[PDB]
Every structure is written in structure tokens, then in C-alpha cells.
RNA sequence: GUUUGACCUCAAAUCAGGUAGGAGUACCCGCUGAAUAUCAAUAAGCGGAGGAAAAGAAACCAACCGGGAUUGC
RNA sequence: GUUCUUUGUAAAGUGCCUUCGAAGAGUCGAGUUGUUUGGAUGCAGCUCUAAGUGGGUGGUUCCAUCUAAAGCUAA
RNA sequence: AUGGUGAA
């Protein structure tokens, strides 16, 4: 509610919903993974 | 346990049973349209007093959890079990006589309805009793997409609108202790606090 | 050097910069015992009568630009609580703060990058994140204190930003601002909104397989910020992170 | 094993009747300092015809002044008063005057209902509810005087 | 008032009820220090008639003195020495047995602003009242001094030493009589 | 209630606001106190105050047609 | 003297009529033992312990005078 | 006699 300062002198990891199939981890490697990029039809799904 | 509790329970049950009996008799007589031995032949609803229009309006239902001293009667038990409202349809002419009975035990806009639907998010799913969350829209499509529901937003829209998912979804969908929490509960008790012929209290 | 536990009890850290730092939270404890006394007395009027961080913000952030260092976590927590034993009033206040911040951002349109992700829809002004409008399936006391501090900071931040009603019932500088200007969009159930129903628009947004106001998908806007290849029903591009 | 005038305490009203008496007394809680101050300020502001107020009598000297006048109808006596001589004679005085008396454990409990930390005795003279007071007096008599 | 009942009850000192009270209280005090702070007097009527008032500034002390310079005088002196910042006003007996005799003494603090602003008690704040028990100005001290009117106190009406000095002096005027 | 509160009691804090020692001592007050009557309620000793201290407004003095705080001559 | 304030159905006094009308307990007192007095008084360890038209001090049936067991107060 | 001094 007031100016307590005034003038003074003092990232993602490609986890998209529709990423390239290479980014998506394979099912076999998902066991070793124990967030992952996944493929989805669209934003609503 | 002292006899006072059971005595109060019996007295409250008798009083509320008589109150429900008068309401049922009045409704039955009104159904016959013989407005010659009843105080009020028409219907009313209280927000102020408002006339009960025949339009099947849909409004949210809330649980009041009481009167506690009144042991729930068999009719109220069955009504709550059918509506699964025991845990703490529409306003049609055939639903009002049953809603009025459970009136003492119970009591919007798009902003409230959308938030409530998207926050509660009950979804019956197969263990068998799973009801965790609105996990994915694809679940609705698989279980309910055949009715024209591609996502939960369709259910929300059809509930707000006079659609069919409003009815279909029925088969698919201070509170503390300690000294600090006693004063707030005592204050809320004032807001926490019924004639048969009187209008329904909302 | 004084150990963390020893320093906390006295009040690894440098003693020189901690000893001087020893100087209402402690006094508030008396309210609990006063309330207990009032409850014991059996009368509530005295309880009602008894019932009836700016300083830390300045030292942590002596200047407004310094707030950007922690604004990331502040906005993260605020948006997480906006969609989440936290009291309903706290959730409402957190949601209101986020809505006001978004409204101010839209007023200036100071947005440069966006990225829809599984975790949530990322944004850049400074980067911030918000989760989806779905229910979220730990000691919340730490979370509550962090939310309180971040809300106190954001109050002053919003005051500075602003210095420099039936809708409630329903709810040049960059290519983002330069592009889409005057392009009034129409959004379907998935600017005018169809949800309010419960034309001058040049484009229409819909993702359903079946459709009847050019039909465009939000992926077009996302990629342009980060209908050439976004006609309804067609496969969207990989949607790679701009960063 | 003590003189009969002593050990008249340790025999007290039962839990149910004691709770009923406390509930009845809580109705006539005297206006605390804050309530009286705010009410007087409101009256002064309004000024800037009245009914007699009703409240419990708790002052030992004031109660004893009311006692022996036969005005007091029911008197509560604490059994843990350190100067026991202050209350050894009170039951006998009440018996001689025919005023029903009830011994309630805890001077602190007695005082908690009169906005005071402790209160040796409490007595009622006026009532709002007379049937309830008469029933409570009869119950207290039948449960205390006819038994002990 | 009830204080009349208290006085009448205390009149029958050898009553079995007062005997029990005294033997309980002496045993209770036997487990406490010789001199200790008393929360409130055990004889409210006596203290009230002695000038004690239940207000901020008054202090009640219980002191134990060996049986067999009177015992009350010794108790007053001890409490004054221990309570250097307080003034002894009066004291009263509270218990006795075969080994010890107990007295209660009430003290007023002249430093407390309540006493200083008390028109009925600010007199004790004068420096001339310092250590009243030391000079035997208390009730017990005056009684032991023989200060009183009548033939029974002619030799000790006011000052046993003063009369000796007066009767030993040789008054000589400028013009011899 | 295999709990939570009213007090009461007892301890502690480099807590806030206060006071006490001791010095002087002719006079004052109290205690003690010598060289069975006499030096003697003196000498000496200890404790407690002020400019004065103590006492002071009678369970008094009197046996009168009564006087009416204490103190000094 | 000079100047502002009072106030609030506020506090006292005078004469009359009327209804009521409290009083310092281990204290007084007696006993004994130490102490003082030219006084036989008082002081002091301890057994007991008093009454309210009552109690203390004085004499020829008692009559005269006060109300102790709390305290303050300049000359 | 009163009060102190040092001295095994």
C-alpha cells in the first residue's frame, strides 16, 4: 500500500505433451527410470 | 450412558416424526387438489418467501448434519441412501414431497459450479471402489464418451445447461480441535441456528 | 564456528554475522493461554474482546528488481496453491493474487515464451508456471509459511506494478504483442467464450474431431510465440521447448 | 476422624445436580467489567424506565449480609477455603435460618462463573424461571440434607 | 457481617474445632522456613481490625520463634531485619505448641505508589517511622514499655530513662530561687 | 477423557519499576549491662530515627459547688 | 485583584417527626518464676483462662469516672 | 569493671 523501496542502488526438459518419439523413453528403459515425456493426441488428451 | 441422552433422542425423534407426518399428509391432500381442509393449497420456498414455480429448477444440495438429537427416521434413511447424501433428479413435482421430508437435514453460478466439479472430481472406476480424481479426460471418453461427453468440460456444460449429462453423470460421479478452534466453532454456531406448512428453507 | 543447532538454540554459520541478528511471534503465544483462560471462565465476551512481513521484505529485497531472484519460487507456490489443511480463505486469496497478476500481465502483454508441458503450462515474462485446472491427488506448515511470505512480497510487487462486476459469477514490443493483434479469437468448449453461453471474430478455436471463423488450434499460437500447419484434426508439430 | 463440625465437607452435591446448579447459575452471570463499561458508554452516548438487573451474589460479606435476612434462597459454599473458619459456621447459619445450602467442590470452580479467579460462596436472591429454581432447591435438599 | 462470627468463634480458643485447626496449621508450617511470605492472613478479622487491607502494598509474613525481649518483639525485629524495605505495622498471634510459638505480622511497603498516594496509609512513608519495632513503637513494644495513663504507670508513663534524667538534673536559673 | 481446561502452591530471568546495609552520633527510642542495701536502669557494648525524638487526645486525675490531649518550668 | 470554568435531578449542615442502633480473646484476669521501683505497681518464661444493661480504677449497702486489649497528629 | 591488642 506504500512505496517501501523507491529509487535504490541495491528451465524445462522437453517434457512436452506431443514430443518426438525419440524423447519418449522406451517401455524397457522405464523400469530403469524408476517425469517422462509422453505422446498425446492433443491438449485435451 | 445416562438416561438423559436416550430420553432426549426419543423426544426429538417423536417431535420430528410428527412434523414429517403432517408434511406428508399435507402433500398427499394437496395432490388431490382438495383445498378445503389444509392451511395452504399452493407451494412456497424460502431463500425471503418465494413461490415454488413448477419449473424443474436445479440447485446444489448441502448437508447440515442435524438436528443431532433427532434420530433419522426410516423414510429419511431411505431417501438419503437413494441420494447417497447420508455421509456428512431435479426439483420436480414428484421429487418435492421427498425433498421436503429431508429438508431439516439438508439446505449457484458458473463460477461456483465449474470450480466444484473440477475440484471434487469423483469418478467411479475399477480395485472396484476407486473414486480418486478426474485423472484424464480419456477416462470420461472411454466410460462416458458414448453419450457425447469428450471431456469433463462437457459434463460441466451439460450440468449448467439443460442437457442429458446432468442426469447421466449421477452414475459416473473451523473443522479442527484444540482451544484455538473452539471460539470459531462457537461463533459459527450462531449461524448454524420449521413448521410443516412453512416454505422450504434454503 | 557456531553450529546451526547451537546458534538456533542461543537465538554452520559465521558468528560475526549471526550474533547481531538475535534482535510479535513470541508474544503471540500469550494469546493461546488467554483464550484457554477465557474458555475456562465459561464466558465468550472476554474471548471476543481479546480477539478484537514488510520489515523482512526490504532486507531480503532492498530493491524491486531483487525480487526477481525469488519470484520464480514465489509464483510457483502461489499458482500451486491457487489450484489446490490450508483454509479455504487462504486458497481464495492465493487465487485472487494470481488472477490479478495475470490481468496485469495481459494489460501490458509482457509475455515472450510459452511451453505447454505435462507438469504445466510454462510461461515467460521472468519464467513462471501454473498447473492444470484439475484436482491434485507433507508438512503443510512450511508450505503455509512460504505461501504467506510470497503473498506478502507479491502484494508489494503488484502495488508497485499498478502504480507504475457480473463476470465474477461466470469465471509492438515483441512478436507476441505484434502478432495476433486485432485477431479476435473465438474459443469453443475446449475474445468470446462459449462457456459463457451456459460475428466479428476472424478465427475460431476448436479441437474436437467434428466441427461445422477460421478453424485454428492453440498450437499455432504457441509455435508463433515460440493455420499453416494447425488445421483441426491434423497432426501438430513436435512442439519443442523454446529454451 | 475429626470433630463433627469438621468433615461436614467432603460430602457434596452429586455430579448431575451440581452440573444442573452450575447451568442455572450461569444464566445470571453478573455483567463483567468490559460489558458494564461498554454498556455505560453506549448509554452515555445515547444521552449525549429501567428494570432491576439480576445477578448472582458472591461476596462473602455481602452474602452473609443477605443471609440471616431470609432473602437468600440457595447458597453455594466452597469446601477448599484455606481459612476454614470462614465457612465452618455458614452451613449452621443457613440451617438455623432455614436457607437451603449446597457444598460444591472447588472455590476456583465457584469463582469461574462470577468473573472472579476464586469465590468462597455464591447465593441467589432474585430470579427471572422460579419453577426451575424451586425444583433445583428441592433436588438439592433431598440429595444432600436428607442424606447427610 | 461475618467478621463478628469469626471473632466469636475465635473467642473459644480451646474448642475442639480450633484445636484441630491449630494442630493442622502448626504441622503444615513446620515444613516451611522459619520466615516466609504468607499469601493471605489466616485470621482476617484480626488483621482487618489491626489496620490491614487487601490492596497492593501490604505483605503478610509468618515467623517462628523459639519458646522460652518478648517473643512478639523478637518476631517483629526478625521480620524487620529481613524485610528492610518494608515497615512493620502490627502483628498477632496465630498458633502455639510445646516447642514453638507462631505469630503473623503484616507489613506495608512505603515504596509502592498505592501506599504513597493513600491518604489513610501514606503516614508510614515518613522517615521517622523507619524500623518501628527497633524503637519499640509497635503495639507490643509500647505495651512492653509500660506506656499508659494512671498511677500504675507513673514511673513509666513516657520514658523510664527520661524521668531518671529529669530527677537527676540540677536546674539553676539566672536568679537563684 | 490411555485427553483438555480453572485455579492454588513452588522455582527460575544478566526481566521492567523499586527499596535495604554503611557513615555521623551532643539530644532521642529499644536491648543488654559492672567495678542482698549503696555508687546503678550510671560507665562500657549492640541495634533504630529526626531536626528535634518519644508521648499525645484517658478502661485519666479526684471524692470535690469537680477538672478534661501530650510536653516543659 | 485579575480570567476561564462550573451542573449533577452532586455533596453537606440546621430544627422537627419517624424506624433502627456494631464496640480490638491466648486478650483481661489469677498462679508461679526472673527483673525494676524509695512506688507495692509495672516489665518478662510458662499451666489455666474471663463477660456484655459487660469490663477497669477508688470508700463506706453500694456511689464517682472512663470504655483497654489498633493507629496518625505541628506547638 | 567495660571494650580491644598481640602472643601456640
Swiss-Prot record, chain A:
Cell compartment(s), UniProt: Nucleus, Nucleolus; Nucleus, Nucleoplasm
Other facts: Present with 2680 molecules/cell in log phase SD medium.
Subunit-level organization: Component of the NOP7 complex, composed of ERB1, NOP7 and YTM1. The complex is held together by ERB1, which interacts with NOP7 via its N-terminal domain and with YTM1 via a high-affinity interaction between the seven-bladed beta-propeller domains of the 2 proteins. The NOP7 complex associates with the 66S pre-ribosome. Also interacts with NOG1.
Function: Component of the NOP7 complex, which is required for maturation of the 25S and 5.8S ribosomal RNAs and formation of the 60S ribosome.
Similarity field: Belongs to the WD repeat BOP1/ERB1 family.
Name the UniProt record assigns to this protein: Ribosome biogenesis protein ERB1
Source taxonomy: Eukaryota, Fungi, Dikarya, Ascomycota, Saccharomycotina
Segment of the intact protein contained: 307 to 376 of 807
Curated annotation (Swiss-Prot), chain B:
GO MF annotation, one: mRNA binding
Modification Phosphoserine occurs at: 175
Highest rank taxon of the organism: Eukaryota
Any single GO BP term: maturation of LSU-rRNA from tricistronic rRNA transcript (SSU-rRNA, 5.8S rRNA, LSU-rRNA)
Alphabetical UniProt keywords: Acetylation, Nucleus, Phosphoprotein, Ribosome biogenesis, RNA-binding
GO cellular component entries: cytosolic large ribosomal subunit; nucleolus; preribosome, large subunit precursor
Localization, UniProt: Nucleus, Nucleolus
Function: Involved in the biogenesis of the 60S ribosomal subunit. May act as a specificity factor that binds precursor rRNAs and tethers the enzymes that carry out the early 5' to 3' exonucleolytic reactions that generate the mature rRNAs.
Family note: Belongs to the universal ribosomal protein uL30 family.
Other notes: Present with 7720 molecules/cell in log phase SD medium.
Protein's UniProt name: Ribosome biogenesis protein RLP7
Organism of provenance: Saccharomyces cerevisiae (strain ATCC 204508 / S288c)
Gene for this chain: RLP7
From-to range in the entire protein, with total length: 56 to 311 of 322
Swiss-Prot record, chain D:
GO cellular component: cytosol; cytosolic large ribosomal subunit
Localization per Swiss-Prot or TrEMBL: Cytoplasm
Keyword Phosphoprotein: no
Signal peptide: none
Predominant location category: cytoplasm
Any one GO MF annotation of this record: RNA binding
Keywords carried by this UniProt record: Cytoplasm, Ribonucleoprotein, Ribosomal protein
GO biological process, one term: maturation of LSU-rRNA
Physiological role: Component of the ribosome, a large ribonucleoprotein complex responsible for the synthesis of proteins in the cell. The small ribosomal subunit (SSU) binds messenger RNAs (mRNAs) and translates the encoded message by selecting cognate aminoacyl-transfer RNA (tRNA) molecules. The large subunit (LSU) contains the ribosomal catalytic site termed the peptidyl transferase center (PTC), which catalyzes the formation of peptide bonds, thereby polymerizing the amino acids delivered by tRNAs into a polypeptide chain.
Family as reported in the entry's similarity comment: Belongs to the eukaryotic ribosomal protein eL8 family.
Quaternary structure and partners: Component of the large ribosomal subunit (LSU). Mature yeast ribosomes consist of a small (40S) and a large (60S) subunit. The 40S small subunit contains 1 molecule of ribosomal RNA (18S rRNA) and 33 different proteins (encoded by 57 genes). The large 60S subunit contains 3 rRNA molecules (25S, 5.8S and 5S rRNA) and 46 different proteins (encoded by 81 genes).
Note: Present with 238000 molecules/cell in log phase SD medium.
Name assigned to this protein: Large ribosomal subunit protein eL8A
Taxonomic source organism: Saccharomyces cerevisiae (strain ATCC 204508 / S288c) (Baker's yeast)
From Swiss-Prot, chain E:
Family that this chain belongs to: Belongs to the eukaryotic ribosomal protein eL15 family.
Gene Ontology annotations for the cellular component aspect, listed alphabetically: cytosol; cytosolic large ribosomal subunit
Name of this protein: Large ribosomal subunit protein eL15A
One Pfam family of this chain: Ribosomal_L15e
Biological process annotations from GO: cytoplasmic translation
Keywords recorded for this protein, A-Z: Cytoplasm, Ribonucleoprotein, Ribosomal protein
Miscellaneous comment as given in the Swiss-Prot or TrEMBL entry: There are 2 genes for eL15 in yeast.
Organism per entry: Saccharomyces cerevisiae (strain ATCC 204508 / S288c) (Baker's yeast)
Amino acid at each position: 500500500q506504500y512505496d517501501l523501496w523507491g529509487d535504490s542502488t541495491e528451465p524445462t526438459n522437453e517434457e512436452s505433451y506431443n514430443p518426438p518419439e525419440e524423447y519418449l523413453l522406451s517401455p524397457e528403459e522405464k523400469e530403469a527410470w524408476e517425469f517422462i515425456p509422453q505422446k498425446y493426441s492433443a491438449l485435451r488428451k | 450412558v445416562r438416561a438423559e441422552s436416550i430420553v432426549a433422542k426419543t423426544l426429538a425423534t417423536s417431535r420430528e416424526k410428527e412434523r414429517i407426518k403432517r408434511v406428508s399428509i399435507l402433500e398427499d391432500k394437496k395432490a388431490k387438489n382438495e383445498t378445503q381442509h389444509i392451511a395452504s393449497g399452493k407451494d412456497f420456498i424460502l431463500k425471503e418467501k418465494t413461490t415454488y414455480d413448477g419449473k424443474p429448477a436445479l440447485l446444489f444440495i448441502v448437508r447440515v448434519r442435524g438436528p443431532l438429537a433427532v434420530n433419522i427416521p426410516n423414510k429419511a434413511f431411505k431417501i438419503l441412501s437413494l441420494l447417497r447424501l447420508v455421509e456428512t433428479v431435479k426439483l420436480t413435482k414428484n421429487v418435492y414431497p421427498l425433498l421436503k421430508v429431508i429438508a431439516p437435514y439438508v439446505v449457484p453460478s458458473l463460477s461456483s459450479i465449474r470450480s466444484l466439479i473440477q475440484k471434487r472430481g469423483r469418478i467411479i472406476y475399477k480395485a472396484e471402489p476407486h473414486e480418486i480424481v478426474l485423472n484424464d479426460n480419456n477416462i470420461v471418453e472411454e466410460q462416458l464418451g458414448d453419450h457425447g461427453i469428450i471431456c469433463v468440460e462437457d459434463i460441466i456444460h451439460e450440468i449448467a445447461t439443460m442437457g442429458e449429462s446432468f442426469s447421466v453423470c449421477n452414475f459416473f460421479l473451523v473443522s479442527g480441535f484444540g482451544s484455538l478452534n473452539r471460539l470459531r466453532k462457537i461463533k459459527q454456531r450462531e449461524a448454524e441456528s420449521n413448521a410443516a406448512t412453512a416454505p422450504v428453507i434454503e | 564456528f557456531i553450529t546451526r543447532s547451537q546458534a538456533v538454540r542461543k537465538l554452520f554459520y559465521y558468528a560475526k554475522d549471526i550474533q547481531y541478528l538475535m534482535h510479535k511471534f513470541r508474544e503471540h503465544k500469550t494469546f493461546a493461554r488467554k483464550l484457554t483462560r477465557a474458555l475456562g471462565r465459561g464466558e465468550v465476551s472476554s474471548a471476543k474482546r481479546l480477539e478484537e512481513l514488510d520489515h523482512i521484505i526490504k532486507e531480503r529485497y532492498p530493491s524491486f528488481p531483487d525480487a526477481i531472484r525469488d519470484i520464480d519460487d514465489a509464483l510457483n507456490m502461489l499458482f500451486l496453491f491457487s489450484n489446490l489443511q490450508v483454509s479455504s480463505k487462504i486458497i481464495n486469496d492465493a487465487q485472487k493474487i494470481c488472477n490479478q497478476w495475470l490481468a496485469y500481465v495481459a494489460k501490458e502483454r509482457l509475455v515472450r515464451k510459452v511451453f505447454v508441458s505435462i507438469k504445466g503450462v510454462y510461461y515467460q515474462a521472468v519464467r513462471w508456471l501454473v498447473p492444470f485446472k484439475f484436482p491434485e491427488n507433507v508438512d503443510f506448515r512450511i508450505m503455509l509459511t512460504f505461501l504467506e511470505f510470497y503473498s506478502t512480497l507479491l502484494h508489494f510487487v503488484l502495488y508497485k506494478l499498478y502504480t507504475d462486476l457480473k463476470k465474477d459469477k461466470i469465471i509492438y514490443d515483441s512478436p507476441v504483442a505484434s502478432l495476433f493483434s486485432a485477431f479476435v479469437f473465438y474459443v469453443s468448449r475446449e475474445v468470446i467464450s462459449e462457456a459463457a453461453m451456459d460475428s466479428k471474430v476472424t478465427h475460431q478455436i476448436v479441437d474436437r474431431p467434428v466441427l461445422k471463423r477460421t478453424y485454428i488450434q492453440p498450437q499455432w499460437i504457441f509455435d508463433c510465440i515460440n493455420a499453416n500447419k494447425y488445421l483441426p484434426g491434423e497432426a501438430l508439430p513436435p512442439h519443442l521447448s523454446p529454451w | 476422624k475429626v470433630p463433627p463440625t469438621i468433615a461436614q465437607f467432603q460430602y457434596t452435591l452429586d455430579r448431575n445436580t451440581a452440573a444442573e446448579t452450575f447451568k442455572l447459575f450461569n444464566k445470571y452471570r453478573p455483567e463483567t467489567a468490559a460489558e458494564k463499561k461498554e454498556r455505560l458508554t453506549k448509554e452515555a452516548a445515547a444521552v449525549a424506565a429501567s428494570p432491576k438487573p439480576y445477578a448472582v451474589k458472591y461476596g462473602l460479606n455481602h452474602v452473609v449480609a443477605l443471609i440471616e435476612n431470609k432473602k437468600a434462597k440457595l447458597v453455594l459454599i466452597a469446601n477448599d477455603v484455606d481459612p476454614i473458619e470462614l465457612v465452618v459456621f455458614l452451613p449452621a447459619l443457613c440451617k438455623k435460618m432455614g436457607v437451603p445450602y449446597a457444598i460444591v467442590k472447588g472455590k476456583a470452580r465457584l469463582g469461574t462463573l462470577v468473573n472472579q479467579k476464586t469465590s468462597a460462596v455464591a447465593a441467589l436472591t432474585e430470579v427471572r424461571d422460579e419453577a426451575a429454581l424451586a425444583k433445583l432447591v428441592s433436588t438439592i435438599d433431598a440429595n444432600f440434607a436428607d442424606k447427610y | 457481617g461475618a467478621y463478628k462470627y469469626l471473632e466469636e468463634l475465635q473467642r473459644k480458643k480451646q474448642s475442639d474445632v480450633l484445636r484441630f485447626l491449630q494442630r493442622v496449621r502448626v504441622w503444615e508450617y513446620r515444613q516451611k522456613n522459619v520466615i516466609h511470605r504468607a499469601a493471605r492472613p489466616t485470621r482476617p478479622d484480626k488483621a482487618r481490625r489491626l489496620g490491614y487491607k487487601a490492596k497492593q502494598g501490604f505483605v503478610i509474613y509468618r515467623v517462628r520463634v523459639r519458646r522460652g525481649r518478648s517473643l512478639r518483639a523478637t518476631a517483629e525485629e526478625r521480620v524487620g531485619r529481613r524485610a528492610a524495605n518494608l515497615r512493620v505495622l502490627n502483628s498477632y498471634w496465630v498458633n502455639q505448641d510445646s516447642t514453638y510459638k507462631y505469630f503473623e505480622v503484616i507489613l506495608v511497603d512505603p515504596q509502592h505508589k498505592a501506599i504513597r498516594r493513600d491518604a489513610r496509609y501514606n503516614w508510614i512513608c515518613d522517615p521517622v517511622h523507619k524500623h518501628r519495632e527497633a524503637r519499640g513503637l509497635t503495639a507490643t513494644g509500647k505495651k512492653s514499655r509500660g506506656i499508659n495513663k494512671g498511677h500504675k504507670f507513673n514511673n513509666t508513663k513516657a520514658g523510664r530513662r527520661k524521668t531518671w534524667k529529669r530527677q537527676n538534673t540540677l536546674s539553676l536559673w539566672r536568679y537563684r530561687k
